[PDB]
Design an enzyme around this catalytic site. Sequence first.
Site, short mmCIF file in Angstrom:
data_model
loop_
_atom_site.label_atom_id
_atom_site.label_comp_id
_atom_site.label_asym_id
_atom_site.label_seq_id
_atom_site.Cartn_x
_atom_site.Cartn_y
_atom_site.Cartn_z
N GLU A 1 0.64 -1.32 -0.03
CA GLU A 1 0.00 -0.01 0.00
C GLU A 1 0.82 1.36 0.02
OE1 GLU A 1 -3.72 0.18 0.23
OE2 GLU A 1 -3.94 -2.04 0.67
N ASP B 1 -7.43 6.72 -3.65
CA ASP B 1 -7.33 5.13 -4.14
C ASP B 1 -8.06 4.94 -5.26
OD1 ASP B 1 -10.25 4.82 -3.78
OD2 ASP B 1 -9.65 2.84 -2.42
N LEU C 1 -8.56 3.61 4.46
CA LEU C 1 -9.80 4.32 4.08
C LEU C 1 -10.44 5.23 5.04
CD1 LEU C 1 -11.78 3.60 1.19
CD2 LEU C 1 -13.28 2.60 3.05
N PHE D 1 -7.95 -7.27 3.70
CA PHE D 1 -7.69 -5.91 4.07
C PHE D 1 -7.66 -5.21 2.59
CE2 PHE D 1 -4.85 -2.77 6.44
CZ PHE D 1 -4.70 -1.69 5.64
N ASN E 1 -6.43 -20.40 -10.14
CA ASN E 1 -7.69 -20.13 -9.93
C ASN E 1 -8.12 -18.57 -9.39
OD1 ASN E 1 -10.48 -21.62 -9.76
ND2 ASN E 1 -8.80 -23.06 -10.41
#
Length: 162
Positions: free
Chosen positions: A11, A20, A32, A104, A132
């Site tokens: 991040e 973001d 956030l 997260f 996957n």
Amino acid sequence: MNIFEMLRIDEGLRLKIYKDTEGYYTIGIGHLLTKSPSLNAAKWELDKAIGRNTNGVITKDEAEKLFNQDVDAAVRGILRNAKLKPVYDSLDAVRRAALINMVFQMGETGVAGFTNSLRMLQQKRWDEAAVNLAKSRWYNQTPNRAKRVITTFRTGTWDAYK
């Protein structure tokens, strides 16, 4: 390495209000702030979070402690999830790191959406899970990050981060 170290790189750090990928007002290390478009709201959220008036500007110190909370918060939500708990129970110390990142980065729900990936994980089928996990929007959107995550799940090593 550890989850902290891991997510710090994913991040980044920013002591000032930023946006973001979605147009969300964020800060510090993935923190956030809000979903409102009002940069005035994003600010208030902050000062609430910091516990002082910040005029939208923070310290390393502040970011790092908020960073700790976020994670623990993360951590909590997993333990509280019915779908995740068992998977997390099953992992090793590195593979969890890798799950926690996911939760997260996307929230509980979005991680519980990877149904078959969750299954293969639990069954220790690394490669398969990998194959996957990559067939998701996630990957197609933040491939950069998704490949580190995936490789982690895959190898159980921190290589993708070295």
